[PDB]
């Protein structure tokens, strides 16, 4: 695999993983270190549609023996994976900093979510409870059982390259399904390694198949199209709303219920009675964790009129102190580069859209360069795509207010009272995360039952969901599916209702 | 006006509590006797469905904020009202869709059972308290209503099947727009009025009558593209369901799709033969074979094939058919509508064309083509000869759903072949095996791909408090009835509460 | 049954209900209207031990067919009971005012709890879920089923003569058990009628047997002793801690897990930031609902130092406005008589104990009489035993502070800060109900996780539990059992674990 | 010192993390070979148990406030540590209680499985969110720790059975005082030390060694009368359990009582005979018949009685017995202690006195009374002849638990009689039926009165993630393992939160 020596490590070359075998087939892509594009992390192929087809048929093959492997034994594989992930946590952390450019602290947390998920589902092997149910008839018994769905197609983003895939891969295999996985082209090395750790843990060959490639016009699109050929009994997607709508459509006509974890425009409310320094810290972290490249990153800070001016002042002071830089050379930075050029490009355009609709720019000068330097940048800002922390004031109903923009940007909006804060908080197409900073029980309550969101934080950030709560969104952010904990079991199994007669006669129900 | 076997009712849509007689007039004739006109009613245009959805959005605000236990009290009232009206609804159902008094009473009883189940669900709807990984922090999950639910239903179970959707939908705090089958408009209107009597606020349930394709049904599905529905629920054909799933999917709706079946019933060499014959017979000819769960194929183990066939044909020959309002002792009555009659007529042609062996049945029962155990006048409506084929796996009669009184026999040899043949259909709704060997029941149970399996019982007659639904072409994973339907009409809201006065970073 | 005409209704005479038959056997007791002891409500016999024995054997007989009656059909009986209770609600309300002296409003609520319980368990007939569980072996399946225990002995107090018995009787029969019930001698008529409503609903004869009589030295004691003869597979008790300890002991040696719902000394905290008028109203109602004759009645109001004087002043103003009287002639009163002479006697003594240990009496002059009248009494205070509203100031560690006293009394205690409020709130032998009035999220939280109680109210009274939450106490208030909702199913069933082999070979688990 | 087959360990009590060598010295000798001294250790007096409970009360304050997911991480560490130590614990268990390496490994594996189960339970422990009947109000339930748990355990499953109590007890935030069996002090000490290595804070687990009656066990039970325990959990004899239940009851404690069995195994005329023989044999002689779940009575259907007896005695005759440390291929080794040996000797006398027919067995295996398939020196310890009787229902051998290698055959005629006879014992722990007729398995399953029933499987070998416990004389309703044990170590806290700024009266 070690094809060349790179700058901050080896340049790895590797192929697809199908039925346990490595398949170096298709035109070569490459992944460059986004903190320093001179460092080439990986060269890897684009799987064509026919190879994805073969991966799904290999998955169908392996599913027969895996689904008949007792769930507690399947759980033992995940238990091995906990220990292996634990052993590899420092290595995976360093590789993640290199390949997607998040800080060592955040990368360790990303890996830890996969460890937590592995442990949770390791013992789920001795749970997976169905029901015994009393019949309305004598000499008859009723049962429900959870059954595996079959072959699961999984397509994932690369902003959480270990955590987010683990939310799908782990419960999928634990419930007895087999998997074809198309990872983000932003994190091919991490994905390959994760697959190999599953292998070391004892996952049978072909239960997990990995096909690398792009999205639109590439492997991703081709994999979605294969739902039309009956090769997938389930589909799970993390990514943009735009792509999610199409995947939902294709899934829908093939009578598949897909897991769709899509975008957000996450509101964070600060009421007049908030602990101001706590709220500032929470807003700041909500905005600039991962350089604002989380589904759950804050979109709009809604600030109660009586503290607006004072909150703005302290918020801008806190934003000004943000360290930015190459996190492999400067692990103390708050955030590093854009993960890829797409996020950078859309973020650059948000400045033009903001100016065109009359948003007021309070802070930020676009791309950080030698020519346009940022006072708290550490290292060489031209080796990658890095963004100025960016703060606007905006009105509701504008594009900056309603549309998701990955990258280090945030809006301030003035609201007056709890009723207006809730109405404005709900004035986007999205409904993923949400937060309110307040001390009045009644205000926390009203926000909690008035917001339309999958997730709400009280005196906490829009980011940082605990790994054992149901994760997902409403409105444009999802379709109702949830990941993590017991709530994800509905995504990867179906209910089998069984009635058993012993009465030696035909008894007619409700008659 | 007065009709033949009762009143001819005229009525309109129910929108925001008001009756709206707007649109071209349709009618529903008694399928046992076309001279009896049951109902005249309008076809809602797309714009009126639009208004119904907006009225639903309006009413949802106060209904979702009505405490769940009070919502449950409305359903409790509905139990008592349904109880009171059971004989009336039974008689009207015999008249309007042509099923027997016995089956119609059972249909109504399912709605009563559903009402009672969800009446106390008002004091349940459990979410979770969950321990945080942090000190001074607490985690919660809550079930929240989705919003406005669009419901489209078939008319073969005109009270039961709609109750499976309407009742949990309103109990969980949603509001509803309902497009009932044009085969059962009167029952649907009445059911809506009973909800009203029970105390359901005006606009929480809106009913828009009309057709399906090129009519109210289709227009209602299209309105998902305008953002007017947060949920959609459908009971009907796979072909229509695929389209509804597609439209729902692009609008990020998770729809309930309860679709067709081709339900296998296996009889192993060791079965109680007379029990299995009775079960196969009832699976086939209950409701004249017009259930989603009606048996499609009887798979008979080689050593008892000849003996089972002989007794099965003797039992089929004894089937009484007729107008169930004049002859309530009949096994089944007419086709519910002309579509089922037409597709049933075609199955004979397709059967002959692919070389299936016709053992019994001569198509439509007429004065000229009479059935020996018909009671009454077979030309007052569309009635079908009981029909039995022998078929091969992989053929159209074997794989494709055919509503109406038909069934196939197939010879299998041993449990492994019975399971493989049982799974050789696009469908996966109901299923059954007759056997006494624990090991054979077990292998069928874990080898079949179906939402529902009966051991020594019919493919029909699901109990109202088990999860109902199918896999493959029969559904998308959603389940109705019991606790399992709550996932269909609510979403999970995860809440974390900090008290530690500092920002604690998870994982 | 109509033996004589009484003052406010008929004087009823009736016997025990055993195997469906009425048995007029034993020395006659009588129940006098506690608001007016000239009104004789009922004459009824004391069942001797041998008749209780026969009732248990009749229960054992009926249990065979009842346990084999499908749970959904058993639920239909409870559904009939909902409708019958509904029909009889005005009648049961009036009879309850007459027989135990609570207000029409409270009596209607008492009956409504039985209606709510009936409805809840009516549909529980189609639930009672056990589990399907995956085996660690191939060709093997695991199951759990809830099974009825057998014959349940139930002994109940009379302060909640319909509600509290319904919490036991209804889930007991729904889960397929049969019952012997010894009602309080304070509410024999209500109990007889309730049994007859079960009969009208379709409960088979002998599934519910009712044996009337006393407690110590009488039917109650004899029924507890029959646990030593193997006649009860379950026991459920509502009453005093003193009696509960003995019942727990007898149950314990016979390997029965009893439901024990015992006394309380329920703390209600008012913090400096409380809505004062809300807290005063809540404390007032906690103290004087049912004339302070609830398990959950407030024992001690713990008032934060900065609002102590102001709270006292408003609390005494509110206590002074309390109406007291015969609730059958004056349904607007807050409370009526003591239910029986025992409660009156113990309450009279609490004055002497209070004086002896130096508690400061702020309000109350003992029994209300013509000679010692109460300014807001309505009617004739000598026709029954009525109590002055009573308010003390006490110190922690005293008898008035730690010991339950049924009747209209309450203590004020000064506390300083949340830590002290919690420590003082926990300084009793009891742990049933509890409450805090506050607006600071952090204070509500600390009380909630610091208190040792089965039940906690935030900005609500210690009384008024909703009928579908788990009800019960810790410490001297109970043994861990809970009533109501799904939580009571553990009380009346046992788990049956079943494993089914199909593999035709002996597979050794964990080996 | 060095012993014969390993080190002789000396150690004291573990209280607040410190080792306390205080009290008269006891010793545990290798029951396979009395010359091998495994351990010397003290008898804790009542006052030291008192101190252990107060140290537990102290440590509980910080442990209960440790977030459940962090508590789960300690158990996760324990999984890995138990895994690492499995061969060592296996060898020590063979030495200290005399079970075979295979069974000892399984014993340890149950603790590993329990550890893993409750490791992730740290992120579960679900309570409920519940809808109020009022506006502007919310309802919650939370699981809370009970406090200080007293645990007393037998030594026939010296790692498994204690793990069923210790692990969920600490995971749910309780603290523990543990009095281990004097038959397994070394294993118990080591297990406590592994908890310590895993990161369990000092004083959360305290271990006090000593005897039972007139010793540390009895004194610990008496301390319930001083208010020092909020929970008690016991595994052992019914006679002791009744007393513990009594003491617990007057102190308003709900105790876990896992007591004896007289476990019936039915073989119907249609059973796979060789499977049933193997299952009966293993049910009887696993652990030398020293399991709570060991078969008490084989109930054999009349038509196969003679043939089953013949094959059963052939299988019993092939049983290897011996020192399992020198001969790991043996089926079973010695009696674990002298009490089991004594009660087993008495069962022969009682059997003869009431007229039971002895088919096989000659009492203690000695040089003078040798057993043909004994391996090694039978005088180094207490070893028993495999023993088989024929008995009548209602006799003492039939109804009373007898630890050790003995079993009864009883003739029954038909399923109804098999069930009635199976229930004719004071006990109700485990049970089994061998049959192929679905209807017979069903009737046994719903007719038996037992906590646990096996169909075509042994009375022994319960899987670690099903609820374990008994009815009648075998227990009080409590269950161990899985989610079902959480009721044993927590209590429900119901919380209602008002936001409506006014007093709303319920019902």
Residue numbers in the entry:
A (entry chain A), C (entry chain A): 1 to 511
B (entry chain B), D (entry chain B): 4 to 510
What does the paper say about this structure?
Found in both prokaryotes and eukaryotes, aldehyde dehydrogenases (ALDH) (EC 1.2.1.3) constitute a large family of NAD(P)-dependent enzymes with molecular weights of 50–60 kDa. ALDHTt contains an unusually extended C-terminal arm forming novel interactions with the N-terminus in the quaternary structure which interacts closely with the substrate entry tunnel. The ALDHTt monomer is composed of the three domains common to all ALDHs: (i) The NAD(P)+ binding domain (1–125 + 148–261) comprising a Rossman fold, (ii) the catalytic domain (267–458) and (iii) the oligomerization domain (126–147 + 494–501). However, the presence in ALDHTt of an unusual extended arm that wrap the facing monomer through H-bonds and salt bridges shows for the first time how the tetramer is not merely a dimer-of-dimers carrying out their functions independent of each other, but that the interaction of the N- and C-termini in CS-related monomers may regulate active site access in NCS-related molecules.
To probe the significance of the tail and its fulcrum points, two truncated tail mutants were made: (i) ALDHTt515 which removes all residues distal to the “Crook & Hook” and (ii) ALDHTt508, a mutant which removes the “Crook & Hook” entirely but retains the “Notch” to try and model other tail containing ALDHs. The co-crystal structure of ALDHTt515 was solved with NADP+ bound in the expected cofactor binding cleft of the monomeric subunit. Comparison of the NADP-bound with apo structures did not reveal significant conformational changes for the adenosine pyrophosphate accommodation within the cofactor binding cleft. The 2′-phosphate group is positioned in the ceiling of the binding cleft with O2 and O3 within 3 Å distance from Glu185 carboxyl group. While these unfavorable contacts could result in electrostatic repulsion, the 2′ phosphate is stabilized by hydrogen bonds with the Glu185 backbone amide group in addition to Ser184 and Lys182 side chains. Despite the co-crystals of the truncated mutant ALDHTt515-NADP+ being significantly larger and better diffracting than those with NAD+, enzyme kinetics data described in this work indicates that the preferential cofactor is NAD+. In addition, these data are supported by the observed proximity of the 2′ phosphate to Glu185, which gives the structural basis for NAD+ preference in ALDHTt. Indeed, in NADP-bound structures, Glu261 sidechain is in the “intermediate” conformation allowing the nicotinamide ring to sit on the bottom of the catalytic tunnel, while Cys295 is observed in the nucleophile “attacking” rotamer. Upon cofactor binding, Glu261 rolls back to make a place for the cofactor, this movement is accompanied by a local 180° flip of the main chain linker loop to bring Leu262 carbonyl group toward the carboxamide nitrogen of the nicotinamide for stabilization.
